[PDB]
Design a protein around this ligand. Structure first.
Ligand SMILES: [Mg+2]
Ligand SMILES: [Mg+2]
Ligand SMILES: [Mg+2]
Ligand SMILES: [Mg+2]
Ligand SMILES: [Mg+2]
Ligand SMILES: [Mg+2]
Length: 225
RNA sequence: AUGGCUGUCGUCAGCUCGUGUUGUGAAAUGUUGGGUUAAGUCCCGCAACGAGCGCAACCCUUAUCCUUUGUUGCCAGCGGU
């Protein structure tokens, strides 16, 4: 699907410097041009479409596909790419224990549902005005970190992740539950908890646009399927 | 040997717990950090997320007005002592 002639133009093949690299990433490194690692795209494209063709499978049963990015470099990009195929995101801070301790965080999805309903569908006026805003500032703080999963219900089946050592907690919560992990592993990040490592850059906004596109496109193809 | 009741630390701001995680284990996190407050007071940050008992608010008293109600209270303008 996605090939090598789009990525080099975009800026996927850039890693960090040569003092921050992870020595486990050495099967995915071409060399070091100007003190900065270059990633072999010959081992990126067959390992990017390897991850997409299984999102053909999991979107061929309407399986729940949670997208993860909290860098705030593409926090706005991860919502809209998850709202293309109306799948799920955590764009601001991943709460610790969101998946292992789900039925506790379930009680806060419900409170988010009642504060969203009361503002629009409730239409209840003439209430205590200094109390009216602590109810109102509650909504905007639960829309913030839980707002991507207001319409999910349970645990997902996949876990698409943008950085693997910025989101190391979200990997370990899907390690211990048996949810597969489809992550983008830059050359500083640890690929052990990731089941399907995808090397590349994660700081150019075009690169994370390219990733989230065809990840959503096969789930858009799966929903049509 | 106790029940009920009280003193005191001390009206000092604290003492916990479920689910989760880390640790072989006693346990730890939550409760820490940045500011702030009379205050675990509030905001922000943070593998934590939530909750309870205590922190305040609801009760009483004092302070200004307003209306209804005027005797055993009152006496302003209104007859005479
Ligand atoms: Mg243990
Ligand atoms: Mg505990
Ligand atoms: Mg503690
Ligand atoms: Mg304590
Ligand atoms: Mg503090
Ligand atoms: Mg309190």
């Amino acid at each position: 699907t996605v090939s090598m002639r789009d990525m080099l133009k975009a800026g996927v093949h850039f890693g960090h410097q040569t003092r921050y690299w992870n020595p486990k990433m050495k099967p995915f490194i071409f060399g070091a041009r100007n003190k900065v690692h270059i990633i072999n795209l010959e081992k990126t494209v067959p390992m990017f479409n390897e991850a997409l063709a299984e999102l053909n499978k999991i979107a061929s049963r309407k399986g729940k596909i949670l997208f993860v990015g909290t860098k705030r470099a593409a926090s706005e990009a991860v919502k809209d790419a998850a709202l293309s195929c109306d799948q799920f995101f955590v764009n601001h801070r991943w709460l610790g224990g969101m998946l292992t301790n789900w039925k506790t965080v379930r009680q806060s999805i419900k409170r988010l549902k009642d504060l969203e309903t009361q503002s629009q569908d409730g239409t209840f006026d003439k209430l205590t005005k200094k109390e009216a805003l602590m109810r109102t500032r509650e909504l905007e703080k639960l829309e913030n970190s839980l707002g991507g999963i207001k319409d999910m219900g349970g645990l997902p089946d996949a876990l698409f992740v943008i950085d693997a050592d910025h989101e190391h907690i979200a990997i370990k919560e899907a390690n211990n539950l048996g949810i597969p992990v489809f992550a983008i592993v830059d050359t500083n990040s640890d690929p052990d908890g990731v089941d399907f490592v995808i090397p590349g850059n994660d700081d150019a906004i075009r690169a994370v646009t390219l990733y989230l596109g065809a990840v959503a496109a096969t789930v858009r193809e799966g929903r049509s399927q």
